[PDB]
Amino acid sequence: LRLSYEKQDTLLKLLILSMAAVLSFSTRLFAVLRFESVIHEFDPYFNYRTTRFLAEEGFYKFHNWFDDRAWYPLGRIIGGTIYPGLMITSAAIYHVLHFFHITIDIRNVCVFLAPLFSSFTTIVTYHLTKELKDAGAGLLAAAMIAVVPGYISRSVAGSYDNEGIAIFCMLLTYYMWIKAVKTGSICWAAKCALAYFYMVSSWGGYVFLINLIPLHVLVLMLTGRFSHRIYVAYCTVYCLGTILSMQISFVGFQPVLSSEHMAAFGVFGLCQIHAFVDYLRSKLNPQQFEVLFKISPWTGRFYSLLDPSYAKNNIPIIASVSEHQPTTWSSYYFDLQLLVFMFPVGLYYCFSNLSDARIFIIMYGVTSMYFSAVMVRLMLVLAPVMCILSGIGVSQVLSTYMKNLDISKNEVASGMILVMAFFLITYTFHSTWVTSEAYSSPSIVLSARIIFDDFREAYYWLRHNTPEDAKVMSWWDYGYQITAMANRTILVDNNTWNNTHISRVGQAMASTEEKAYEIMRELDVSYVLVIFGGLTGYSSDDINKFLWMVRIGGSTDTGKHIKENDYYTPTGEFRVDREGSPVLLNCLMYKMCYYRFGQVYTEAKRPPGFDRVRNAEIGNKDFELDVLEEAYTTEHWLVRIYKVKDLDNRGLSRT
Amino acid sequence: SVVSVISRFLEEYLSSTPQRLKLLDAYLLYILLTGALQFGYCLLVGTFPFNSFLSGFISCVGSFILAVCLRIQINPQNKADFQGISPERAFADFLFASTILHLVVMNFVG
Amino acid sequence: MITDVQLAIFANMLGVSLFLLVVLYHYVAVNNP
Amino acid sequence: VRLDFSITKDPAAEARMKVACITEQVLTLVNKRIGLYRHFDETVNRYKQSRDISTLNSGKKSLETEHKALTSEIAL
Amino acid sequence: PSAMTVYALVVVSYFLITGGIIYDVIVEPPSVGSRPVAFLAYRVNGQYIMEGLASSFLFTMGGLGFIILDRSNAPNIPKLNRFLLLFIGFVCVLLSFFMARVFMRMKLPGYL
Amino acid sequence: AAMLGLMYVYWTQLNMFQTLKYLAILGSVTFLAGNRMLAQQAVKRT
Numbered sequence A: 001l002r003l004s005y006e007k008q009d010t011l012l013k014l015l016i017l018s019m020a021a022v023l024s025f026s027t028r029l030f031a032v033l034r035f036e037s038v039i040h041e042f043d044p045y046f047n048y049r050t051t052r053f054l055a056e057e058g059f060y061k062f063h064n065w066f067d068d069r070a071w072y073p074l075g076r077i078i079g080g081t082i083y084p085g086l087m088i089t090s091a092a093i094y095h096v097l098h099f100f101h102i103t104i105d106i107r108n109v110c111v112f113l114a115p116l117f118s119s120f121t122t123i124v125t126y127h128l129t130k131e132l133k134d135a136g137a138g139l140l141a142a143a144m145i146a147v148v149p150g151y152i153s154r155s156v157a158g159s160y161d162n163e164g165i166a167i168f169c170m171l172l173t174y175y176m177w178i179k180a181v182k183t184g185s186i187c188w189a190a191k192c193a194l195a196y197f198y199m200v201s202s203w204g205g206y207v208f209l210i211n212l213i214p215l216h217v218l219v220l221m222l223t224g225r226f227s228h229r230i231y232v233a234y235c236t237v238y239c240l241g242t243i244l245s246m247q248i249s250f251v252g253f254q255p256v257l258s259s260e261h262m263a264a265f266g267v268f269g270l271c272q273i274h275a276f277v278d279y280l281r282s283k284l285n286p287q288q289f290e291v292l293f294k295i296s297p298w299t300g301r302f303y304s305l306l307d308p309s310y311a312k313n314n315i316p317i318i319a320s321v322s323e324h325q326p327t328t329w330s331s332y333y334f335d336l337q338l339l340v341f342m343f344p345v346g347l348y349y350c351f352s353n354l355s356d357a358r359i360f361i362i363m364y365g366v367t368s369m370y371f372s373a374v375m376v377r378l379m380l381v382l383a384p385v386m387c388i389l390s391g392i393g394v395s396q397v398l399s400t401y402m403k404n405l406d407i408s409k410n411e412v413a414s415g416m417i418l419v420m421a422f423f424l425i426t427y428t429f430h431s432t433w434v435t436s437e438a439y440s441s442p443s444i445v446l447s448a449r450i451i452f453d454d455f456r457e458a459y460y461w462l463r464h465n466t467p468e469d470a471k472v473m474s475w476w477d478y479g480y481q482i483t484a485m486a487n488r489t490i491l492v493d494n495n496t497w498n499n500t501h502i503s504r505v506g507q508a509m510a511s512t513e514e515k516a517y518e519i520m521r522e523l524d525v526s527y528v529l530v531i532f533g534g535l536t537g538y539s540s541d542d543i544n545k546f547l548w549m550v551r552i553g554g555s556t557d558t559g560k561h562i563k564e565n566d567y568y569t570p571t572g573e574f575r576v577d578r579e580g581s582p583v584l585l586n587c588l589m590y591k592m593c594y595y596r597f598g599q600v601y602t603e604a605k606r607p608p609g610f611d612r613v614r615n616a617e618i619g620n621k622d623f624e625l626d627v628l629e630e631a632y633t634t635e636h637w638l639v640r641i642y643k644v645k646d647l648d649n650r651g652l653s654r655t
Numbered sequence B: 001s002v003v004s005v006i007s008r009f010l011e012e013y014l015s016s017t018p019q020r021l022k023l024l025d026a027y028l029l030y031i032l033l034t035g036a037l038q039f040g041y042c043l044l045v046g047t048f049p050f051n052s053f054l055s056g057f058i059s060c061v062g063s064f065i066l067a068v069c070l071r072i073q074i075n076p077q078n079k080a081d082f083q084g085i086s087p088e089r090a091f092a093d094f095l096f097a098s099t100i101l102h103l104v105v106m107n108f109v110g
Numbered sequence C: 001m002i003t004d005v006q007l008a009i010f011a012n013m014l015g016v017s018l019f020l021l022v023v024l025y026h027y028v029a030v031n032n033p
Numbered sequence D: 001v002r003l004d005f006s007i008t009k010d011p012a013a014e015a016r017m018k019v020a021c022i023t024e025q026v027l028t029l030v031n032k033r034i035g036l037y038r039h040f041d042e043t044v045n046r047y048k049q050s051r052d053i054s055t056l057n058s059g060k061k062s063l064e065t066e067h068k069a070l071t072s073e074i075a076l
Numbered sequence E: 001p002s003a004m005t006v007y008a009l010v011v012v013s014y015f016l017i018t019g020g021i022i023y024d025v026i027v028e029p030p031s032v033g034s035r036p037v038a039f040l041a042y043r044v045n046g047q048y049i050m051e052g053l054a055s056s057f058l059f060t061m062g063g064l065g066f067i068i069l070d071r072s073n074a075p076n077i078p079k080l081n082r083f084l085l086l087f088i089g090f091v092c093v094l095l096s097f098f099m100a101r102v103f104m105r106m107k108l109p110g111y112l
Numbered sequence F: 001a002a003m004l005g006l007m008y009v010y011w012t013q014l015n016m017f018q019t020l021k022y023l024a025i026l027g028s029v030t031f032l033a034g035n036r037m038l039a040q041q042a043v044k045r046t
């Protein structure tokens, strides 16, 4: 009342912003209230085990670092193969607290760093949208960003992966570029180069930034809107950004001799070839001017995003992961509700008033949408831009219907604000439900309250009851955990940087017992860890993914007898019952995944030796492993650890 | 046959251009020449140390581009696209960008 | 600690209040003198 | 806040600031004057005034109006 | 040129993409129910062609409705035409936002 | 001039953790003096 318009306005903007921030930080906090604060899934177990070694030992003792506890015979270098972004933002955030005598743990400032960086995303989004248009349509973006279900899936409290901290860097870089294009100041461009540098060091998806920018300038150059502002900004950002990007040891000399970063360069030369021509035309006349008138190819990984079928045909490892398939009508709406509708309206409102800044948002939305269409995992990029577009659209509708009200036809004018409020509420509800029920489930804690924590008990056993120089060999999926929890030297890791060693391990499985033993001697493997999952109903059994093992071991020069369409039955169906193919019933994988199993009564009224996951009886009821004596089998038979026997003493053929 | 126009253009650019702006062009030519020499020596011998030549060449392309940016902003004629960017706030910005560029060049070179 | 249900209810209430407040802010914005 | 860190000083920008500050002083003075005059008229003219307190209130209101006129002349 | 003639193309591509055309082409799903049931039982991302194109069309309507609404507000429009245009926009908005929700519930029983 | 000299003293001897602090100090001194001189110049130009 008595408060002036200024004070009221700013106190409302501040209130709403603070509330949005708290909302975002307190909605990705479900996996912690239910189960204790522990990092989850296959990747966050490596980033953690690296940030920890970078905390105690100074940065200079981590830039170069040879980890001889992964790919045992080979050994992988962690110093120059990983983007050191997350580890230096977490080490710094931990060191500052220690300097302030907070003395927090390194496993507690490393779990709550995704939600914290999803509380700074809100502010950056609010500004990135307070630039394209009025503050009025900026807040409406922040709150929607706070509770966007697709983004929340990759940034819950416990997912220490460079994917909930990458979006923040992308937004900051875009805000810097938008400011540079809007104003043209050298300083702003610089402050963008720096953001790109802090983004090329944390997220492997920085090719987007050196491919949307050239696209943006090309469009701002084909329609005839290329002024000196864009020229100055682009050139400065290019130079500084590329030189900064080359610093990182992992990137090396990629920006200058690769076909992924050839866009920026081409647009640079076509920028000059344009500015100079304009200058010449200004100082000349039509008549005289008329008179005068090694590089590597597209790497398969990034090429798979263009051709959506290249993966299936050629790369037999990128198609394995579930989250590598095209998105359906049931993923877009499930993760983004009411945003999908808002996207066309936001586009239309942009296309209505083209400007230097907007022609960038439209390009980003058009590209990101297609990239999300090809692969479900890319939904990271899509949700923020869609949210920004949604913010620019609902607000416009509200603004259009906010002036018609007599206080500021009346019934029709209200009908819109009321419908919009109802849609916003429905969106908040659906977002909370999606975060709660589904996108929040601990990976290593199979639960139905009954808790199955075998994935931890077996690793702890390994870590405590094996010689300090074991060689636990398991599928590349579990490499990150075994080295962070079991603390052994797993033969294959999750980076899959050698497609012959992994093929080797594949061959060692789904083969005759002899061949397997022979392959399990060159690498000096001792223990063997297979995730049975049959007795508990686990969906992702080792047998379930055993097709990938047979299809990635028989695709190299070393082994070809393992050809597919041989483990199948005459009718080509993968049945693991008594009528299955004889070779299948004899491979090392199955032989070590159903050993002394055709006796347990898994179900009330079923044949003794039943399998819950495949709903079929076992074929090889009783057999004795020749080389693999048993060593441990967890209470629920969820993870079985065997141990390769040594060469026979008397030199007999067996064992 | 096409030299008359070139000479006329140069003459024009030697009367219609204010001082304290030609000097910028001279320094720009200097950078363009040091870059040309660098590239020529690279072609003549090839590159054993790649990061050495690459960062002893960017350290010139970046400077050249910063100089051109300063000439653009300083130019009074081009004071419609840039609003509120006084010449002093352009020179200081150029100095800051140059400092970053040189620091990174020093870090990258051997 | 805090029951999951409690946190969900708090999230719902906060989100609804934040959206109503955003609408109110749009009304105040248009009404500028 | 106490650090200017500005290379170029523009007169119109500072003029707007000063005019807004003056308009704030004036609005506060008008609000205070209306509150005072109304309170004096309500607390001194209930049933008996004797033309003594009313004269003092009129003098105070004239002084306030004179100060507001001086501030308006200064801003003009 | 013709800046709008581009927004039309973009909207058409958006309709084709949000109907999972990439999924259809990559992994051909039979557009049939095994009495035919259009929607898949429980898979979060399992698209039959009928579930896809039909769901997408709804989103496109859920966008054109708003565009029609905002366009109607333009002044100097006869009341007879304005009323019809606003009616169409409201019907498209409400109908798309309810049909999509019902479709989602049907595809994934236990929703909300 | 000292800032540029440092750009050479960080080549031979120093590491990226001592050069940065020195720059953080010399640059600040350069910035404050520069700003003052630039303001004076701007006033004189008008």
Ligand SMILES: CC(=O)N[C@H]1[C@H](O[C@H]2[C@H](O)[C@@H](NC(C)=O)[C@@H](OP(=O)(O)OP(=O)(O)OC/C=C(\C)CC/C=C(/C)CC/C=C(/C)CC/C=C(/C)CC/C=C(/C)CC/C=C(/C)CC/C=C(/C)CCC=C(C)C)O[C@@H]2CO)O[C@H](CO)[C@@H](O[C@@H]2O[C@H](CO[C@H]3O[C@H](CO[C@H]4O[C@H](CO)[C@@H](O)[C@H](O)[C@@H]4O)[C@@H](O)[C@H](O)[C@@H]3O)[C@@H](O)[C@H](O[C@H]3O[C@H](CO)[C@@H](O)[C@H](O)[C@@H]3O[C@H]3O[C@H](CO)[C@@H](O)[C@H](O)[C@@H]3O[C@H]3O[C@H](CO)[C@@H](O)[C@H](O[C@H]4O[C@H](CO)[C@@H](O)[C@H](O[C@H]5O[C@H](CO)[C@@H](O)[C@H](O)[C@H]5O[C@H]5O[C@H](CO)[C@@H](O)[C@H](O)[C@H]5O)[C@H]4O)[C@@H]3O)[C@@H]2O)[C@@H]1O
Pocket: A075, A076, A077, A080, A081, A082, A083, A162, A202, A203, A204, A205, A207, A208, A211, A212, A214, A215, A218, A249, A250, A252, A262, A263, A265, A266, A267, A270, A301, A302, A303, A305, A306, A317, A318, A367, A371, A378, A381, A494, A495, A496, A497, A498, A499, A500, B047, B048, B049, B050, B051, B052, B109, B110
């Ligand atoms: C499956 C697969 O693949 N995988 C993979 C993996 O993966 C992974 C990953 O990684 C991970 N990650 C991490 C981080 O970890 C994960 O990931 P994730 O999950 O995913 O996560 P993230 O990432 O984060 O996230 C993700 C997300 C996503 C991404 C998202 C996305 C989104 C988006 C959006 C995207 C986008 C897309 C796109 C496409 C874009 C687009 C856009 C748009 C818009 C569209 C549009 C379009 C367009 C185009 C546009 C257009 C536009 C326009 C405008 C138009 C245009 C216009 C125009 C005009 C144009 C123009 C034109 C022109 C210009 C023409 O996870 C995953 C999984 O798990 O990874 C891995 C890695 O690790 C990988 O692996 C790798 O690989 C590689 C390659 O490969 C190779 O190989 C192959 C095969 O074969 C072979 O191999 C095998 C096996 O191995 C065998 O067996 C066989 O036999 C054979 O042999 C081949 O083929 C190829 O070729 C290749 O070769 C490799 O390499 C690697 O390896 C490596 O590594 C390993 C481990 O690490 C190791 O072990 C090994 O050994 C190796 O190592 C190496 O390397 C390293 C690094 O690399 C290092 O460190 C080491 O040491 C070594 O090194 C060495 O060697 C090398 C060889 O190469 C060399 O090179 C080096 O050297 C270098 O370096 C160094 C350092 O480093 C240096 O030193 C040097 O330098 C030096 O020397 C030189 C000589 O010359 C000189 O020069 C210089 O100077 C020196 O320097 C020195 O020195 C001086 C005195 O002297 C001083 O001064 C200074 O200082 C110093 O420095 C250099 O050179 C050495 O030697 C592996 O393996 C896998 O694969």
Ligand SMILES: CCCCCCCCCCCCCC(=O)O[C@H](COC(=O)CCCCCCCCCC)COP(=O)(O)OCC[N+](C)(C)C
Pocket: A218, A219, A222, A223, A354, A359, A362, A363, A366, A370, E001, E002, E003, E004, E006, E009, E010, E013, E014
């Ligand atoms: C999902 C994939 C679907 C593919 C769809 C591709 C569309 C994505 C490109 C988005 C770019 C939007 C920018 C844009 O459209 O600019 C508009 C319209 O003017 C033009 O832009 C004309 C050129 C349009 C294409 C320019 C880039 C082409 C592809 C980029 C490499 C500006 O037009 P104006 O120049 O403002 O209007 C003038 C028209 N007169 C009649 C007056 C002459």
Ligand SMILES: CCCCCCCCCCCCCC(=O)O[C@H](COC(=O)CCCCCCCCCC)COP(=O)(O)OCC[N+](C)(C)C
Pocket: A063, A084, A085, A088, A194, A195, A197, A198, A201, A247, A248, A249, B100, B103, B106, B107, B109, B110, F010, F011, F012, F014, F015, F016, F017
């Ligand atoms: C927001 C922007 C900042 C984001 C920070 C993100 C962290 C990324 C750092 C990744 C490290 C890349 C590799 C690297 O830094 O090189 C290290 C030197 O190591 C370092 O110095 C790391 C310093 C990290 C902070 C740098 C601030 C960047 C400001 C640019 C002016 C090696 O340098 P030195 O080992 O010191 O060189 C020794 C020999 N010389 C003669 C060459 C001096």
Ligand SMILES: *[C@@H]1O[C@H](CO)[C@@H](O[C@@H]2O[C@H](CO)[C@@H](O)[C@H](O)[C@H]2NC(C)=O)[C@H](O)[C@H]1NC(C)=O
Pocket: A468, A487
């Ligand atoms: C994981 O196992 C390794 C192998 O023993 C442990 O590394 C040893 O750590 C102790 C620290 O008390 C050192 O004194 C030894 O020298 C290390 N071993 C070797 C071979 O160098 C490591 O500590 C274990 N990780 C834990 C316990 O967290």
Ligand SMILES: Cc1cnc(NC(=O)c2cc(S(=O)(=O)N(C)C)ccc2N2CCCC2)s1
Pocket: A204, A205, A301, A302, A304, A305, A317, A318, A319, A320, A321, A375
């Ligand atoms: C089995 C796997 C699971 N996850 C994996 N990692 C990638 O697939 C991947 C990695 C990079 S990268 O930047 O790390 N590159 C190594 C420099 C880029 C793109 C990538 N994919 C995005 C779409 C197709 C390729 S492999």
Ligand SMILES: [Mn+2]
Pocket: A043, A161, A162, A163
């Ligand atoms: Mn990751």
